[PDB]
DNA sequence: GACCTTCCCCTGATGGGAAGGTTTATAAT
DNA sequence: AAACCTTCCCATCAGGGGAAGGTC
């Protein structure tokens, strides 16, 4: 099975790992470690930024890939904003500082 | 144990039960307190002036007869015409005779005819609040006139109470303390405006409530005692019969609602059944309290069970449909037909399917999917909101194609098209809207638009745009 | 757009800041319109519109009037996505404590008042009152009382005496509390009063106070006055198939909190008694706490389902869910998977990718490249063109694949090689072709295993897949310099088959010009392949200045080795192809090729070797049949003989000559010594089986049995499987370990019978389960390793320390296990190492000890090299390139930016899945004792008196090649510094593990039977009689003598009484505690210990890993320390080491330190970044604690960055972070 | 040409109905 | 669960008016 651009989970904007073949492959922690071992940094980023999360990253990367321009515009993983919500909805206040 | 259900289950074992003695014993105490607070209103001219306004408006179609009175301690509609002029036998004997010597022992017989008319608690509470607002109004003036002399002029509190206790009406006490030559005396001429005019809202009360400033304090002084008696009795009542609420609440286990929620929503109905109970009828309290307890549990369930709240009526109707389908399992052998309950029920036929269609419950997204793996329902949930990128690219391409094509037409047609449609502009414009700032109106634009849409309908200038249509 | 993540306490007003409304009605979508209800949990007015750029009422639909709150509903028509950002709050009626600040082990509210937890828990449940701010009364400021205690207490003091009950009391107590005045008082209680008891909680309470102030957040906020709600998009109610609605448990819990708060307010305004309202308050606290963390009070279940609903905190921690299954590992687009197969024709750099897979994968590239070349009008048309499978799109796909690397991954990713980049090769079908040479690195077979593909997007990810991840760039493993690319089964078999010779092959002994003619002989069918023919061959060897010189000459060889010579590269000589050429030989040949000619030649050499191997191994027949297994005709006898050897032992036990556990060994020993007979019966009959006439003279040579060549080549069949194949297979034992006195007596060829198969079944089950259930064990170990490592990267050029660990060969017992050259290769010297003569220079201060210096130091007798290590390096938040070493896929110095921590953790984690009389000197030399006390006795010879005694051997070189230990009272026949003959017995006396092991070694766990150590020199002395345990005093020599200790008498001693014993001596026997090894010895001794022990368990089986890696873990274990004095200073080692040393450069006095020893899981606990900790550690705790302190994370590291989705500060990310951080903060 | 009858669009009525609220009396712990 | 009752929101019906059509 293989997938390039499929659906996404509602809760966390991640490629639906269902639909039994149309779903995206899982890139667990060990895979991230293997990437960390090499100097590959943009590979890991585009993995967990463009190809999974970043409601804008997927769209921008796709609109670029067709223009012959292979360049990612990394944003913010939606899972992390959801984590900020789930932590801040508690009696915990998490925030971000300067540019 | 830990769980807060244990704190409660053994918090009631303290106050011993009350049967055959307790009930009738402390109900008399309840009534003996409300009798103290009731006669407090018996002497309140504002209550008379307020009763006249709400009385004559009953004969003018505003307020119902049985909506202002629960009865008379003296369901008969004929017992009314006989107690609306016989009670005035003391109405005008003490009011216009102040012109106030013999008007001191003739106030009880005028107030006696005022305790034979049981008003509905709705207006009764307004009367209690009326006396409360009168006390607060009178008192505001005292807490004004006091701190204007003590906290400002530095006078002893006792020299204030000594000169104030007894008058509380005129200025004969204030201007008399000027000759005391005390250290606070020389500071009484500056506040002679915040204390003199202060009686304008204090002394005037006397001509409204027809009573001295001090009597207004006596009334509430005893009224508070009466209401305290009532409170202290009813709390013990509900504490005693508390166990009954649990006995009733244990009949609703899997009601989409925790146990303590049920027992509490039932305690509310227990309190309600208490406040509206008369020990005179003889009927035991266990029979009466059960109605309000069980109803405040049932309706509460109907209101807090479903995550999607449903009006009470629908809950009743659905449960009835379920009952009929239950008692017919043994008749049909397995289960009734869909259009069968239509007749057994009072409702019509076609409403059954909708009533049952909406009767679904939400499934927790954490419900593990098949294979029993950690995979849950919330993992297979898609997102049909975001448009796929394969279409976003088409949008960004059509934008440019339309831009180039429109830039191929004339200037007039260009702005007219970008106007009639919301192209690269906030909010497209109507016909006369375009004509408003294009110097020729109402049909000029109607011709320009058709001409441009035709110059684009022609090929060799539409191929690019025409490809974007695929059907 | 951000470079700092902070976490602080949530104030009841800072909550009202975010909230866009107050949810009042505990409702949802209506019931009949499916529309949100006013002030409900989904209220569009409070949170946000249902549709996109559309209001709930339906009056404003156009995208024009965006910012406007339609007075109809109050719903500002905007992006519906904002319903994911829209917070909310609830006006809680009665105060409610936050469970997290009361239930966590360091109970925040608990030691914020020094008030024990069991007291506050009684106050909350409304089962006791509590005093507050008494001032001057009979009661304190914090004191508990019961019903009857509060009864006649208000009469004594109506005013100035307040005492509340429940959450109101706890809160108001936290409000009137002075976190300032109390602090100034707790300072002296730690100053004067001794007795650690007076310093147990105080030393941690003063810290909570001062940090509670320094952060800024106030203690009253420990009680949630306003409960914030979660956006409805994070807890959707979305419908589903069939009409059923799917909701989250967060809803049920929120709805509960709202219901109960409403009920409480209704009572408070309905004039209810206390027995009702106090029950409602507790129900409210219960619901709120179960909403934040469900499973700490009573585990509030859900509705129709019995399963407990998931609360807020539960949506963060755990291997499942957020932070572990979301932010570190996510699914990805542009990927796939399939069943992998062979693919020999492929090069070592390319892999076969199925066509349809490539089409679906590169869809976005295909569309654009089509619309560009004038073949598709617009993107939509290109979609239909590829959806129709038009012919042109195949060539378009071939144009887009061209040099576009892809990534292949094997399901368990142990090491970094688990993901490797290959060059796509379009292929028909659906199977993924994989290169056989890489199957070793991937650790995959072709029995159905599946692999995943990943397509890079950025030009960067395409370059990193060519210059970092490409297959031909990863040849030698980083864990050990040995190449990870070595021929497997078929290849080595074909080569070994060619490089063989019998004696009488068709036309042997003749001569030929060279390889061309030898192949002309083989292919024609005139000559054999195994002939002993000697021919001429030109062996190139670049000599004398680097100039290639081809010296042609004749040599003795075979027709086969000479043919194989055609593949061999230029620089390599002919001696590499003159042997049997087994697996263990082909590998070393390829290794010499690599470090002689370079990367580029080695690659093509490997590919050629594979092709030729497979071809020859195929055409050699090379099969197996029933007749191949040669059952020794002596078997029958050899069996019955040892079968009757027990018939005497049986009567020996039946009469009473031997007891049970005595004749047991009588059977076991004769059976074990008889199994060698049957095993060697087929062995010596199979190693010389084939018998042929050399020119006409009968003679036996190396056998040609099909099964045996597979063994002598190492292709598949090992040695034990041979003893099992033809002869009977041993004796099994029950799970007890009771080996059965009933061995197997039948072989595998003849066939096992019913009885014998049962014990085999147990053996099989033990192996199967022990290997299967071990997966999670090794995985867990390597996981904790990576969590202790990550932040460690190579940044600093050179630290500037001469320290260096002292590298000496392992030489132990009989013979060396690993020479000094290995544990020094590629490392760096610390101090100038010289010849055996003093005042010389064999090597300067610090230089890369590559192969050259290795040979140079090997010439001399210098067996002791001072090498710098990572355990000792002057560097802050990193390491210096020199101290690490060089080891990589290249022999060059480690680059500035590679994250050595992760690669080391993997280098230890991948090999984890493989684990579970007198002395006789050998070599000639001279006896050299070490640390021994001796005394002459009757015999005149020498006897040892010191328990510890080393027996080195100073040969004519001056080195040590022998090291034996001899116990107390030994028999010596030479003495110290005495000459010995060829194996003279100079010693005589009367003698009267796995992965769970290395886990303990890393965790620094205290041993079961510790061994006391000495703290100073001097004569030791006894002391007071046996009271409870015993005593022992320390008698120093010159300095102060306050040291002593209590050692139980139930534990035997070893140290000598009236004898000097230096610090760190063996005061008793048993294992050793690393904590006690750091104090009395130092920082180098402990690391030298952990490495030497952890290396043994791996040395047992076939595992080799450079000490460097383990050194990195040791260095990460002592990153903490304890301060001895205070000094001029006002914990972390690096931070204090710089912060106090900057003022120590100033004339101000410094503060001394003491390295602490934290296990890999205890060191991963404390870390500058709190996010990285809460990622794997106990999230719920970590966040609570790092929240009260107002801790501030700047991320500075790996896992944090991958969380927020940023270029990791390492490698390619380290260069970007370099250029950014340079001008950053400057 | 007016006068009477006719033909369509706003005010506001006001019939219908869904949704809520208050009581219910043998005792009932 | 049934019984009698008030508020609100519905989506629709007599009634008014501004002109409109057609002829003794
Ligand atoms: Mg396999
Ligand atoms: Zn609106
Ligand atoms: Zn260094």
């Amino acid at each position: 099975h293989a997938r390039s651009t499929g659906s996404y989970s509602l809760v966390t904007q991640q490629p639906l790992g269902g639909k039994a073949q149309f779903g995206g492959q899982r890139f667990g922690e060990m895979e991230v470690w293997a990437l960390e071992a090499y100097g590959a940094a943009y590979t890991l980023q585009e993995m967990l930024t463009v190809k999974s999360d970043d409601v804008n990253g997927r769209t921008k990367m796709y609109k670029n890939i067709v223009d012959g321009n292979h360049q990612m515009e990394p944003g913010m993983p939606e899972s992390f904003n959801v984590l900020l919500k789930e932590i801040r909805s508690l009696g915990i206040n998490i925030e971000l500082e300067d540019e | 144990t830990t769980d807060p259900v244990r704190m409660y289950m053994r918090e009631m074992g303290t106050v011993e039960l009350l049967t055959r003695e307790g009930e009738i014993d402390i109900a008399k105490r309840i009534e003996d307190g409300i009798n103290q607070v009731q006669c407090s209103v018996a002497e309140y001219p504002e209550a008379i002036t307020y009763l006249l306004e709400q009385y004559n408006r009953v004969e003018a179609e505003e307020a119902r007869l049985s909506d202002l009175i629960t009865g008379f301690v003296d369901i008969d509609p004929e017992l009314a015409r006989e107690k609306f002029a016989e009670l005035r036998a003391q109405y005008v004997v003490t009011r216009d005779t102040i012109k106030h010597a013999t008007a001191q022992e003739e106030i009880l017989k005028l107030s006696e005819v005022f305790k034979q008319f049981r008003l509905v608690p709705k207006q009764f509470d307004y009367l209690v609040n009326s006396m409360r607002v009168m006390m607060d109004r009178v008192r505001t003036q005292e807490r004004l006139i006091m701190k204007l002399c003590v906290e400002q002029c530095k006078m002893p509190k006792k020299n204030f109470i000594t000169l104030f206790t007894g008058n509380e009406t005129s200025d004969t006490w204030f201007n008399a303390a000027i000759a005391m030559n005390k250290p606070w005396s020389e500071k009484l001429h500056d506040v002679s405006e915040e204390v003199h005019r202060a009686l304008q809202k204090l002394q005037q009360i006397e001509e409204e409530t027809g009573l001295t400033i001090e009597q207004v304090k006596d009334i509430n002084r005893r009224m508070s005692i009466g209401e305290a008696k009532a409170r202290r009795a009813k709390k013990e009542m509900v504490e005693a019969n508390l166990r009954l609420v649990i006995s009733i609440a244990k009949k609703y286990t899997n009601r989409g609602l925790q146990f303590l929620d049920l027992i509490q929503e039932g305690n509310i109905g227990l309190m309600k059944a208490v406040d509206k109970f008369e020990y005179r009828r003889g009927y035991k309290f266990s029979t009466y309290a059960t109605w309000w307890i069980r109803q405040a549990i049932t309706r509460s369930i109907a209101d807090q069970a479903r995550t999607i709240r449903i009006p009470v009526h629908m809950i009743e109707t659905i449960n009835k449909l379920n009952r009929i389908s239950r008692q017919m399992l043994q008749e049909m052998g397995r289960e009734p037909t869909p259009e069968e309950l239509a007749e057994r029920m009072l409702m019509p036929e076609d409403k059954i399917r909708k009533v049952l269609k909406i009767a679904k419950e939400p499934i927790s997204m954490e419900t593990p999917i098949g294979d029993d793996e950690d995979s849950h329902l919330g993992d297979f949930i898609e997102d049909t909101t975001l448009e796929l990128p394969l279409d976003s690219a088409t949008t960004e391409s059509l934008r440019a194609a339309t831009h180039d094509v429109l830039a191929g037409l004339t200037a007039r047609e260009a702005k007219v098209l970008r106007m009639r449609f919301g192209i690269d502009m906030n909010t497209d414009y109507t016909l006369e809207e375009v004509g408003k700032q294009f110097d020729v109106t109402r049909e000029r634009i109607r011709q320009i638009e058709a001409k441009a849409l035709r110059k684009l309908r022609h090929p060799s200038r539409s191929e690019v745009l025409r490809s974007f249509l695929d059907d | 757009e951000f470079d700092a993540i902070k976490i602080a306490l949530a104030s009841p007003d800072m909550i009202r800041s975010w909230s866009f409304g107050e949810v009042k009605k505990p409702e949802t979508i209506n019931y009949r319109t499916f529309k949100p209800e006013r002030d409900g949990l989904f209220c569009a007015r409070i949170f946000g519109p249902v549709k996109d750029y559309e209001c709930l009422c339906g009056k404003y639909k156009r995208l024009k009037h965006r910012g406007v709150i339609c007075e109809k509903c109050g719903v500002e028509v905007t992006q519906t996505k904002v319903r994911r950002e829209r917070m909310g709050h609830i006006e809680l009626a009665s105060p409610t404590a936050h469970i997290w600040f009361l239930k966590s082990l360091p109970s925040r509210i608990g030691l914020l008042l020094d008030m024990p937890l069991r007291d506050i828990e009684r106050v909350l449940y409304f089962e006791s009152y509590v005093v507050i701010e008494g001032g001057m009364t009979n009661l304190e400021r914090q004191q508990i009382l019961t019903e009857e205690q509060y009864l006649d207490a208000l009469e004594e003091f109506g005013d100035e005496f307040d005492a509340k009950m429940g959450a109101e009391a706890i809160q108001a107590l936290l409000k009137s509390m002075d976190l300032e005045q109390e602090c100034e008082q707790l300072r002296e209680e730690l100053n004067e009063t001794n007795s650690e008891t007076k310093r147990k909680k105080l030393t941690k309470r003063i810290k909570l106070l001062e940090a509670f102030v320094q952060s800024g957040n106030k203690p009253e906020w420990m009680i949630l006055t306003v409960l914030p709600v979660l956006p409805p998009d994070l807890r959707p109610l979305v419908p589903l198939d069939g009409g059923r609605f799917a909701t989250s448990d967060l809803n049920d819990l929120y709805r509960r909190v709202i219901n109960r708060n409403n009920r409480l307010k209704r009572l408070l305004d309905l004039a209810a008694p206390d027995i009702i309202v106090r029950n409602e308050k507790r129900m409210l606290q219960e619901a709120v706490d179960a909403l934040l963390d469900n499973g700490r009070r009573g585990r509030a279940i859900t509705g129709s389902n019995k399963r407990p609903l998931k609360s807020l905190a539960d949506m963060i921690k755990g291997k499942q869910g957020r932070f572990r299954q979301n932010l570190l590992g996510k699914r990805v687009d542009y990927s796939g998977r399939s069943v992998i197969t062979v693919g020999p024709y492929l090069r070592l750099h390319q892999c076969g990718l199925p066509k349809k897979m490539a089409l679906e994968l590169f869809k976005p590239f295909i569309y654009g490249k089509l619309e560009l070349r004038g073949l598709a009008t617009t993107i939509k048309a290109a979609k239909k063109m590829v959806e129709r499978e038009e012919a042109v799109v195949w060539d378009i796909l071939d144009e887009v694949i061209r040099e576009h690397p892809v990534l292949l991954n094997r399901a368990p990713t142990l090491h970094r090689l688990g993901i490797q980049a290959f060059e796509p090769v379009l292929i028909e079908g659906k199977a993924i072709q994989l290169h056989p040479l890489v199957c070793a690195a991937y650790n995959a077979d072709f029995d159905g295993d599946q692999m995943a593909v990943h397509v890079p997007l950025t030009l960067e990810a395409q370059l990193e897949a060519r210059a970092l991840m490409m297959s031909t760039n990863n040849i030698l493993s980083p864990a050990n310099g040995e190449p990870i690319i070595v021929p497997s089964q078929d290849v080595v078999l074909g080569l070994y088959y060619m490089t063989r010779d019998c004696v009488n092959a068709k036309g042997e002994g003749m001569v030929l010009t060279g390889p061309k003619e030898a192949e002309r002989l083989y292919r024609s069918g005139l000559a054999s392949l195994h002939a002993r023919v000697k021919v001429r061959i030109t062996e190139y060897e670049k000599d004398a200045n680097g100039e290639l010189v081809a010296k042609t000459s004749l040599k003795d060889t075979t027709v086969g080795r000479a043919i194989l010579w055609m593949i061999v590269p230029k620089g390599l000589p002919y001696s590499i192809v003159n042997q049997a050429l087994g697996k263990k030989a082909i590998s070393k040949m390829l290794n010499t090729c690599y470090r002689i000619l370079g990367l580029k030649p080695t690659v093509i050499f490997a590919d050629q070797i594979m092709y030729t191997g497979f071809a020859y191994a195929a055409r050699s027949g090379a099969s197996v049949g029933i007749d191949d297994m040669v059952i020794p005709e002596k078997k029958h006898e050899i069996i019955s003989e040892a079968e009757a050897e027990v018939a005497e032992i049986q009567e020996q036990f039946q009469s009473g000559l031997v007891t049970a556990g005595e004749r047991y060994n009588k059977v076991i020993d004769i059976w074990a010594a008889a199994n060698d007979r049957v095993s060697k019966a087929m062995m010596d009959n199979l190693q010389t089986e084939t018998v042929i006439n050399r020119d006409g003279q009968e003679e036996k040579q190396v056998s040609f049995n099909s099964i045996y060549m597979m063994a002598d080549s190492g292709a598949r069949g090992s040695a034990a499987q041979i003893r099992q194949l033809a002869g009977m297979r041993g004796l099994m034992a029950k799970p007890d370990g009771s080996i059965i006195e009933t061995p197997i007596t039948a072989n595998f060829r003849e066939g096992l019978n019913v009885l014998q198969y049962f014990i085999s079944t147990h053996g099989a089950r033990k192996g199967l389960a022990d290997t299967a259930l071990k997966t999670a064990n090794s995985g867990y170990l390597t996981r904790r390793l990576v969590d202790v490592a990550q932040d460690l990267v190579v940044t600093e050029d050179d630290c500037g320390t001469h320290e260096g660990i002292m590298m000496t060969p392992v030489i132990e017992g009989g013979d060396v296990k690993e020479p000094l050259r290995d544990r020094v290769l590629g490392r760096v010297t610390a101090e100038d190492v010289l010849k055996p003569g003093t005042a010389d220079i064999l090597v300067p201060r610090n230089t890369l000890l590559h192969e050259q210096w290795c040979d140079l130091l090997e010439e001399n007798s210098v067996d002791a090299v001072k090498v710098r290590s990572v355990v000792s390096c002057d560097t802050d938040f990193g390491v210096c390139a020199h101290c690490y070493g060089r080891d990589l896929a290249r022999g060059h110095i480690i680059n500035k930016g590679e994250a050595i921590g992760v690669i080391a953790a993997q280098s230890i984690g991948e090999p984890g899945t493989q684990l579970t009389s007198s002395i006789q000197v050998k070599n000639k030399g001279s006896i050299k004792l070490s640390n021994v006390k001796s005394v002459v006795n009757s015999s005149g010879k020498l006897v040892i008196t010191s328990r510890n005694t080393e027996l080195k051997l100073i040969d004519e070189f001056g080195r040590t090649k022998e090291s034996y230990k001899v116990p107390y009272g030994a028999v010596l026949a030479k003495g110290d510094g005495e000459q010995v003959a060829g194996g003279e017995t100079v010693a005589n006396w009367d003698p009267h593990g796995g992965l769970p092991r290395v886990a303990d070694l890393f965790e620094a766990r205290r041993p079961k039977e510790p061994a006391i150590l000495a703290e100073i020199s001097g004569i030791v002395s006894f002391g007071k009689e046996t009271k409870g345990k015993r005593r022992l005093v320390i008698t120093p020599v010159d300095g102060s003598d306050p040291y002593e200790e209590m050692i139980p008498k139930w534990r035997q001693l070893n140290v000598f009484e009236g004898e000097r014993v230096e610090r760190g001596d063996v005061i008793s026997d048993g294992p050793e505690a690393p904590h006690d090894i750091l104090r009395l010895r130092g920082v180098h001794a402990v690391t030298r210990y952990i490495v030497n022990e952890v290396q043994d368990v791996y040395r047992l089986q076939g595992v080799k890993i450079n000490d460097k890696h383990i050194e990195v873990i040791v260095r990460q274990m002592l990153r903490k320390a304890t301060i001895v004095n205070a000094g001029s200073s006002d914990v972390e080692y690096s931070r204090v080491k710089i912060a106090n040393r900057e003022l120590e450069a100033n004339g101000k006095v410094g503060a001394t330190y003491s390295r602490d020893l934290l296990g890999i899981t205890k060191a991963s606990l404390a870390t500058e970044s709190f996010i990285s900790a809460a990622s794997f550690q106990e999230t719920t705790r970590v966040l609570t604690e790092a929240a009260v302190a107002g801790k501030r994370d700047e991320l500075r590291g790996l896992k944090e960055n991958v969380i927020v989705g940023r270029l990791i500060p390492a490698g390619t990310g380290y260069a970007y972070h370099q250029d950014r951080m340079r001008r950053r903060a400057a």
Side-chain angles (χ1 to χ4, degrees), chain C residues 55-60 69-75:
Chain C
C55 174
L56 220 198
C57 65
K59 202 169 187 174
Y60 295 59
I69 12 81
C70 175
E71 9 68 25
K72 215 78 158 189
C73 40
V75 178

Side-chain angles (χ1 to χ4, degrees), chain C residues 146-162:
Chain C
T146 200
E147 294 285 300
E148 313 168 42
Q149 294 178 59
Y150 192 54
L151 180 77
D152 45 68
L154 294 164
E155 305 123 37
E156 299 171 32
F157 298 110
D159 268 310
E160 106 198 50
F161 161 73
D162 270 295

Side-chain angles (χ1 to χ4, degrees), chain C residues 410 444-449:
Chain C
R410 215 230 102 92
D445 338 86
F446 297 135
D447 59 69
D449 303 319

Side-chain angles (χ1 to χ4, degrees), chain C residues 797-801 868-869 872-875 879-884:
Chain C
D797 260 308
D798 214 316
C799 53
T801 176
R868 297 160 59 176
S869 170
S872 169
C873 177
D874 166 64
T875 307
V879 190
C880 102
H882 290 58
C883 272
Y884 183 73

